[PDB]
Amino acid sequence: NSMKNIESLFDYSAGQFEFIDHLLTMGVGVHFAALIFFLVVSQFVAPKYRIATALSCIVMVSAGLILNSQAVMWTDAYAYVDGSYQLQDLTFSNGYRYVNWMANIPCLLLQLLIVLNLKGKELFSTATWLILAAWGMIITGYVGQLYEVDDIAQLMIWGAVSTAFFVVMNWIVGTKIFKNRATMLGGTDSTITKVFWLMMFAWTLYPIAYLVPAFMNNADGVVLRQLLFTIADISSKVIYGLMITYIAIQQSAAAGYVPAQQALGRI
Ligand SMILES: *C/C=C(C)/C=C/C=C(C)/C=C/C1=C(C)CCCC1(C)C
Numbered sequence: 001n002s003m004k005n006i007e008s009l010f011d012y013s014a015g016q017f018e019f020i021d022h023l024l025t026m027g028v029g030v031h032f033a034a035l036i037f038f039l040v041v042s043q044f045v046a047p048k049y050r051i052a053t054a055l056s057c058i059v060m061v062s063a064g065l066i067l068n069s070q071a072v073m074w075t076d077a078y079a080y081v082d083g084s085y086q087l088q089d090l091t092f093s094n095g096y097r098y099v100n101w102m103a104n105i106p107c108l109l110l111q112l113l114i115v116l117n118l119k120g121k122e123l124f125s126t127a128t129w130l131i132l133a134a135w136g137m138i139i140t141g142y143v144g145q146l147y148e149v150d151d152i153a154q155l156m157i158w159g160a161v162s163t164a165f166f167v168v169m170n171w172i173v174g175t176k177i178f179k180n181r182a183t184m185l186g187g188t189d190s191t192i193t194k195v196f197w198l199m200m201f202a203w204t205l206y207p208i209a210y211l212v213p214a215f216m217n218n219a220d221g222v223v224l225r226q227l228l229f230t231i232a233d234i235s236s237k238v239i240y241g242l243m244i245t246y247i248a249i250q251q252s253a254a255a256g257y258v259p260a261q262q263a264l265g266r267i
């Protein structure tokens with residue numbers, strides 16, 4: 001897949017190359033720092049919601065590992081030769097992110113369903129439809145990106161199909177959020193709508209990143225895409241995870257769980 005991606009087409013200045021390495025490395029640190037926070041804080045979440053914080057830990061590690069791997073793959077792929085970072089071998093590709101999404105997107109959605117107070121059959125069926133829609137979106141996008149170098153029209157049609165799945169997934173998310181807001185405790189009925197908007201914003205960055213080959217096919221475009229994934233990853237995983245956990249603790253306290261109450265009170 002490395003020859004199928006635009007990164008393989010260029011030599012990089014030291015500035016471009018190092019900035020990309022630094023973005024990815026910084027992303028690793030952010031996710032792992034957040035992982036410690038979610039871990040320590042899970043003790044203050046009621047059993048009914050605790051799986052949500054646990055899912056944030058799994059997401060932080062999954063994301064951090066993939067970012068770590070991307071950083072090593074990048075440094076393995078290029079060597080500074082004759083004044084520029086030049087491709088030495090086929091080690092780098094964005095495909096690994098997509099594969100990872102097959103696991104992370106379902107986790108991110110499930111945590112949302114949990115704090116929404118869905119349970120039993122509704123939880124199971126909603127999770128099923130959502131993950132199918134997510135998988136449809138990710139798989140079609142993965143295929144489309146295989147054509148970013150030699151067939152832009154194909155990247156676009158796979159993108160369109162993928163976008164249909166995204167739109168339908170968003171409809172399910174939005175509908176469940178807006179219809180279940182009233183069940184939310186401790187003022188979280190307000191907070192949860194912000195979570196919806198945050199997802200719409202952050203998730204929308206990925207398709208933009210996906211289209212960079214069509215509109216900025218050059219080395220600075222490669223930098224821009226990595227920058228966009230970095231903003232998106234932190235918003236969709238970390239900020240989103242902190243909001244989910246806040247909602248979970250807040251609901252836990254309102255429901256009578258003492259450790260949550262002590263926690264909010266100690267701060
Ligand atoms: C933690 C990672 C997340 C939240 C990834 C989200 C990815 C998307 C919403 C991807 C969407 C895409 C489209 C809607 C069309 C182009 C192909 C994709 C898969 C990038």
Ligand SMILES: CCCCCCCC/C=C\CCCCCCCC(=O)O
Nearest residue numbers: 013015016019223230231232234235
């Ligand atoms: C919401 C999460 C925020 C993510 C923070 C990302 C940190 C970097 C932000 C801006 C730095 C831009 C400077 C780019 C200089 C380009 C160097 C080059 O390519 O030659």
Ligand SMILES: [Cl-]
Nearest residue numbers: 046047048049
């Ligand atoms: Cl409980």
Ligand SMILES: [Cl-]
Nearest residue numbers: 063100101104
């Ligand atoms: Cl990921």
